[PDB]
Amino acid sequence: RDPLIVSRVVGDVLDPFNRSITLKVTYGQREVTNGLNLRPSQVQNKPRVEIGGEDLRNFYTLVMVDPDVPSPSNPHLREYLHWLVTDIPATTGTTFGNEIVSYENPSPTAGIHRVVFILFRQLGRQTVYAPGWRQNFNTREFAEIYNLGLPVAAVFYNSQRES
Numbered sequence: 674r675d676p677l678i679v680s681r682v683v684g685d686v687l688d689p690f691n692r693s694i695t696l697k698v699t700y701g702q703r704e705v706t707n708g709l710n711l712r713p714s715q716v717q718n719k720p721r722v723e724i725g726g727e728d729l730r731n732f733y734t735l736v737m738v739d740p741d742v743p744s745p746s747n748p749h750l751r752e753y754l755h756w757l758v759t760d761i762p763a764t765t766g767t768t769f770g771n772e773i774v775s776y777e778n779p780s781p782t783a784g785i786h787r788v789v790f791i792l793f794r795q796l797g798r799q800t801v802y803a804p805g806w807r808q809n810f811n812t813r814e815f816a817e818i819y820n821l822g823l824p825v826a827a828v829f830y831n832s833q834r835e836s
Contacts, residue, residue: 676707682789682829685740686752686812695725696792696826705790709830716788716832719756719767719776724792724826726763732798733761734821736791736812737776744783754810755779755788759801773803781832789829793821 677683683690698705700720705711724733737756741748755777761770779788793816801819804810816822 677827677829680708680787680829682740682787682827686738686789687791687824687827688813690823690825690827692826694727694792694794694825695723696790696828697721697723698790698828699723705828705830707829711788711830711832712835713778713780713832714835717778722758722767722790724761724764724766729763731763732759732795733763733770733825734759734793734795734801734819735761735767735770736789736793736815738789738791738810738812739779739781739786740789741781741784741786742808744781745785745787750808752810752812754804754807757801757803759795760798773801774807777807779832782834785831785833787829788832789827791824792826793823794825796820 698720735758738752740751742750742753757774758767758770
């Protein structure tokens, strides 16, 4: 009974997992904490992302998705892939990885959307293909294809139209 379960991030997006390494997502001066309400105008640019780790030789992949597109009550486009960064060296951040899908600012036009950052540990440096489009991305299926196992970290905020 914790925030990723209550919000159904673990459920809709992710399988059960044990958080193990640091994931810090910051937009300007605001740290993303689970369930924080952020305005579309605050998330216009990509946030700063720090990741943790133990073994320096490990690489990580970060996924940012929106499971509630176009709206939570009928999410037929889910998930919408907002950002994909691979080969992030242990204990660095997205600035140090390969950005294969650039950050697209989330701008919901119906209901409350969950915006989710998920971090996986790779088995090594690997080549990941980009999806041909951003909608109907599947994080679970993605993880299975690229041997990413279970997430090592995840965090999410809530976004909704200001108007």
